[PDB]
Amino acid sequence: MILDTDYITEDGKPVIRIFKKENGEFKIEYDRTFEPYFYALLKDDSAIEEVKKITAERHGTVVTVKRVEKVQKKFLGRPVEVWKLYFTHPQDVPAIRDRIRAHPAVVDIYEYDIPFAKRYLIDKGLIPMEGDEELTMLAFAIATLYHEGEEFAEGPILMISYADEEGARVITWKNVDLPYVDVVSTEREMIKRFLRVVKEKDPDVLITYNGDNFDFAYLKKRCEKLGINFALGRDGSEPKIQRMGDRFAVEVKGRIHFDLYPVIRRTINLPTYTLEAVYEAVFGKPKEKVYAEEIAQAWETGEGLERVARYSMEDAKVTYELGKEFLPMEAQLSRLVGQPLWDVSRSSTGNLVEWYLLRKAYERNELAPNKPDEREYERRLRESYAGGYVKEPEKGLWENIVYLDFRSLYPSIIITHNVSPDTLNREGCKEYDVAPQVGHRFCKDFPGFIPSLLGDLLEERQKIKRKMKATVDPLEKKLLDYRQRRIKILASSYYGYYGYARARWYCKECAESVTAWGRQYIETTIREIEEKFGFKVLYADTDGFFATIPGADAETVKKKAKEFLDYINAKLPGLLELEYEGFYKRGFFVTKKKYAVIDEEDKITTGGLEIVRRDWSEIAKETQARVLEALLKDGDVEKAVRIVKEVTEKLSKYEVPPEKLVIHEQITRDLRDYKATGPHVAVAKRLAARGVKIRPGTVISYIVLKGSGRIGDRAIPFDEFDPAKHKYDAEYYIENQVLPAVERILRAFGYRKEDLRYQ
Template identity: 50%
Template structure:
């Protein structure tokens, strides 16, 4: 807020701040958050690009280069306007919901939205708004810790015939169903048999008097359910549909942020007891569901926070739906276990790292390298092809052949330059870096040639053969000359391609030496029997 530009008589809406907010809540997930990438992802359109180092030259030279620069600058403004028009309805609904200005709401965190909603509602409920913590109290709160969600160590490897379940809005539904609120904690009106007793912790929550926070949250959940019913009666894409969809999304964003508000040390309604009670109850219900699924003959291969993946075995889809009904019959309040979907195959590596293919042929990838921004395209593309071979065709052998082919192409110098470029953002002034990584060295080389290099710049570089460390050999893509330079194939094999795929291939019984050699084969012990 302190650095935001304020314009008298105008509301300054920052599209970058909107994108940052949507990325924070997981509504947009990209490798790079450049204007070009967001524009392509959200609207499916392309816009002209222009080399950072050529701007000054084009301005001085004029002619066609200046015309191209002006077209690029105009496209920046046009793309920003179009993205703003897409995002504005959602933020307008958030503004109406929490009762703050559009300028402020577009720059808030999800937790701040919750807090301002509660401040707005407090007067009508006769609630006293708690003060913000002072420095000493804030420091004490920040030292407090508690156990979070349950994440099961997956059964590593390739699995087939999977079904996934997840709890609908697990933490919000726990808050409402168990009346989690600072004012209902360890109340005097309920005895031990009457109150909700939190597993592992022993905290008690009142069942006779509804708390302020769960009352507000319940109203949001109910209103969103009503809107979703209305949406089913409307034609997607119509103005009325888009307006209601923005409204239900605003309700979802705020509802899902209540738990985080309880656990944030700077929040007015901060309560460690409430936050850890929510996660304790979450662990209780996911453990309960895992045990029940296994009693029913399903094999649980992975579980994380509010969902689980099971091998169906001999069970029919009808039996899966009956299992779901039985679980939901016993859940309290507004809690509900939902069927997320059926998956023909999935490969599970470690906690938070897995990939599946759904019945429509779409890949769902969590925690694997090709979503990171500091990997060259050759590594991302290879990992994508490996996952396609494993999940679409069920063929680890074909995945190994893909890797060997890419290794050969790198060794033979047959990989295009654009597939070798590594992009890393400069997060501070060059002089502030103590650890001098490859992107910092590349940035220094750019500055020496007169290019403007500032914090926030995306540095694009290639690793070339030659003396010195990996950092020393980082060459800005603008300086790469194929006539006198050669990319370092060994670097791309050992530090890009193999690291991007080995986590996947290891759980399938392959070793690095099997994949470096064109003739290498899987050498798992079982091959010898």
């Protein structure tokens, strides 16, 4: 089983290292024969003697071409002749790259920016995470002493907890009387003891939650301040910090650092992603949270530290439990893509597509297109195209609604119509498929590059969905529902990759052909169900639509819907298929992207409403939820109007807990890049002068107080709110939070804001 690959340099030569786990034993295989290379397209073969003489320099090393070789390849399915240029060290490629491209006889260069370790995995046909080997796992978490305005890791680490199959333990240097706590003398002894535990346990996988940005960087700064060699790698090395766009990433040589946070962010949809929220969302059970102020208070006063150790132990225990459930899913993704679990777990969906396309290109002798240059990148950014069809809904409260959905609409269109840049506007084909409105024709004689790969991906989704019904365990059901939704997003991201400005296989024509076909298929399906089956489409987005037959019972709508499904699916060709997704007793459609329906089991589902958004106060969400329940489940409009009146009364009388008035908004840039200033930005600028570091990703939690000026003038952070001296802006939360979230719903019954507010 291949776990990871990298390369080291021995006497100026690269040495590929393959970290493996075969027969329960860890092994490092070495390879000194793999040669870095990139391709070049020449105006004439006679010029190869000049390109061989082109040199460059990196550090104090002279870079030359080691060997050339003429190769017969394909570029988007067309025969092409390129020259394969070999080199000694992979770092020779970036040093000599542009000089070779700048030669007047070199048309272009190709495949010049592929990392050496990933190139090895592709060229040798190696698939990581392959086999039945059982990987040992060990999770850990840290608890630190934090104070406002201090530098990062200025205070010491207080506790280090770890968990595996043997249980969970906490190492700390203050005496805490608990059977799972090991007490040492100093912070240095604690870090050394944890380092020994890892060396003795020798886990293949180190599991963290946000270890890429906090736990590992905190341990590093603390180790260099205390002069500790943080030797965690199986080669005796220290954890290495890497840069991936905005955030950082930590790797441990010889092992797999599995950070759950990027995985959970791609797998589950939650309002907040604290460890306690993720744990309760997966295992249904609550987890207590202890904040850094209570940790610092308990440590410095010496009172209440058992509660802190319990929170630290549960942090490691829960992180291990979540790592166990989510590793096999990420391991399968590492097999589908063909890259190490470390990269696939934190990779964005764009690179998940491209890394697989790079592997498949090499398998089919297809020369890979280059990443766009600056001029082409800016050009791709400006241009856009039409997307999905969104119908202005029929507003009001409807009954006996069915939702009909297309099964993987965009992937089905790519396969059915062979939408691919190697088939777009090809010449000499016997059969073409022309996209509506945009007129792009596509060859059907042979399976296009991307379409020849989406079928298997869709097949795995149905295999997971089939096991997603035979299972009775809700835990297995949820994890399988999680995994199949992952495959749907990945398969759908193949369409988006066509419009991704950084995509190698960028195809704007392919992208708009997919959406143009999608718009035609749903518009046709809507017209058919209304003309030939007497339905009334109430709302429609990109791949699905709600509909009903007015003045008909639930049974009539169900049988007629199933009948229309037989009709329209016989007309729809290829992989285009409409499914019966659900029936709903009542439904409300506020506007585009804003709806709410209740199924026959009294379960309410909403789309786009304030109930889902995290930038709205809790009192507004709580109020909107109760209103929707009174309308969808009880059908009592006066009870819903009543509820809004009680809330506006309780707010006006200051009887609502200020906790439900907190507004959460994320800072999306540096505080200097803000052209306009709002309540959360104005508060964040106050938090900077108070000592809190503000950066993109920082969530600002503020509350609006009764006062003068703009809302930003009245906004203060919640941690500064004292209910003894501050009276919140009851008028603001009435007029700007509760009332707007419910007025657009209750307007369909004739009610205005004046009829709902308290007087």
